[PDB]
A paper describes a structure:
We determined the structure of the complex between the N-truncated dominant active form of [name] in complex with the [name] domain of [name] to independently ascertain which structure of the [name]-[name] complex is correct. The crystal structure of the complex between the [name] (residues 621-703) domain and N-terminal truncated [name] (33-216) was determined at 2.96 Å resolution. The V shape of the [name] domain is stabilized by formation of an inter-helical hydrophobic core with nonpolar residues (Leu663 and Met667 from the α1 helix, Leu672 from the connected loop, and Met680 and Leu684 from the α2 helix) and inter-helical salt bridges comprising residues, Arg659-Glu688 and Glu664-Arg681. The obtained structure is essentially the same as that of the pMOB1A-[name] complex, with small overall root mean square (r.m.s.) deviation (0.79 Å). The helical axis of the αA helix is kinked at His645 with the following part of the αA helix docked into the hydrophobic groove between antiparallel helices H2 and H7, and the αB helix interacts with the negatively-charged patch. Four negatively-charged acidic residues (Glu49 and Glu51 from the H1-H2 loop, and Glu55 and Asp63 from the H2 helix) of [name] form direct salt bridge/hydrogen bond formations with six positively-charged residues (His645, Arg656, Arg659 and Lys660 from the α1 helix, and Arg693 and Arg696 from the α2 helix) from the [name] domain. The observed [name]-[name] interactions in our structure were verified with mutational analysis. Alanine mutants of highly conserved arginine residues (R656A, R693A and R696A) displayed decreased binding affinity to less than 20% of the wild-type.
To exert full kinase activity, MST1/2 and [name]/2 requires coactivators, the scaffolding proteins Salvador homolog 1 (SAV1) and Mps One binder 1 ([name]), respectively. Phosphorylated [name] protein is switched ON to increase the binding affinity to [name]/2 and this binding accelerates auto-phosphorylation of the activation loop, A-loop (also referred to as activation segment or T-loop), of [name]/2 kinases for full activation. The phosphorylation of [name] occurs at two threonine residues, Thr12 and Thr35, located at the N-terminal extension out of the C-terminal globular MOB core domain, and is required for binding to LATS/NDR kinases. Here we report the results of structural and biochemical studies of full-length mouse [name] in the autoinhibited form and that of the MOB core domain bound to the [name] region of [name] (hereafter referred to as the [name]-[name] complex).
Numbering used by the authors:
A (entry chain U): 635 to 698
B (entry chain A): 39 to 100, 104 to 213
Write the structure that this text describes.
């Protein structure tokens, strides 16, 4: 009885918090990237690494 | 809150992965949802799986239809989708493994049948749904489901017939 209700109550906050957390991950990354003067190649490279990190995380989250 | 922003595909994120995750999520939601109403769809309440008298649902798709009651249809549907998610050749669990080139097909299929669950619940068992405070949670789950589906056009609109009653109403 309660399970579905609890889960659904917490789910919106959950997924929205996930969204903003990912946004902040990216923004934090490029914020540190702006300082210390890396070249465009490294930028794109580590960008791809970030995307791969996220995809990996959600895939891992999906199962156990 | 609003989910239009959330359900969107992020930069660099593979579509099939996103779809897989969300599909699994909605699958769990629906699973618990029917898990709370399983005592009410008793095959005497729902002799045939149908989204109301007009909109009727058959398991297989024609030459001709075959008898399909609701508890059978749904019990199966759960078992089936579970088998699909556990299929490593469709839903990989290791990062090195890529999706099959036919993923979006069974994605659209699964999501379609999940919507069919949403439909039987919204129509046939709307009354016992209110017997416990639950309509809000259902509205939320279904809202997220529809926002996602629409945002990526994963179910034919002709299929979304028996619930439009709230669809356009919910996306105010
Ligand atoms: Zn029923």
């Amino acid at each position: 009885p309660q399970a579905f209700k609890f889960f659904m109550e917490q789910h919106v906050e959950n997924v929205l918090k996930s969204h903003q957390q990912r946004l902040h991950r990216k923004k934090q990354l490029e914020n540190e990237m702006m300082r210390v003067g890396l070249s465009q190649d490294a930028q794109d490279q580590m960008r791809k690494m970030l995307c791969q990190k996220e995809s990996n995380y959600i895939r891992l989250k999906r199962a156990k | 809150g609003n989910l239009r922003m959330a359900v969107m595909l992020p930069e660099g994120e593979d579509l099939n992965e996103w779809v897989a995750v969300n599909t699994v999520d909605f699958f769990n939601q629906i699973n618990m949802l029917y898990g709370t109403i399983t005592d009410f769809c008793t095959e005497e309440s729902c002799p045939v799986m149908s989204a109301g008298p007009k909109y009727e649902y058959h398991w297989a798709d024609g030459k001709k239809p075959i008898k399909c009651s609701a508890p059978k249809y749904i019990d199966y549907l759960m078992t089936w989708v579970q088998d699909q998610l556990d299929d490593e050749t469709l839903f990989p669990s290791k990062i090195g493994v890529p999706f099959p080139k036919n993923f979006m097909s069974v994605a659209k299929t699964i999501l379609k049948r999940l919507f069919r669950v949403y439909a039987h619940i919204y129509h046939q068992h709307f009354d016992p749904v209110i017997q416990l405070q639950e309509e809000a949670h259902l509205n939320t789950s279904f809202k997220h489901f529809i926002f996602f589906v629409q945002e990526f056009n994963l179910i034919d609109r002709r299929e979304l017939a028996p619930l439009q009653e709230l669809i356009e109403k919910l996306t105010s």
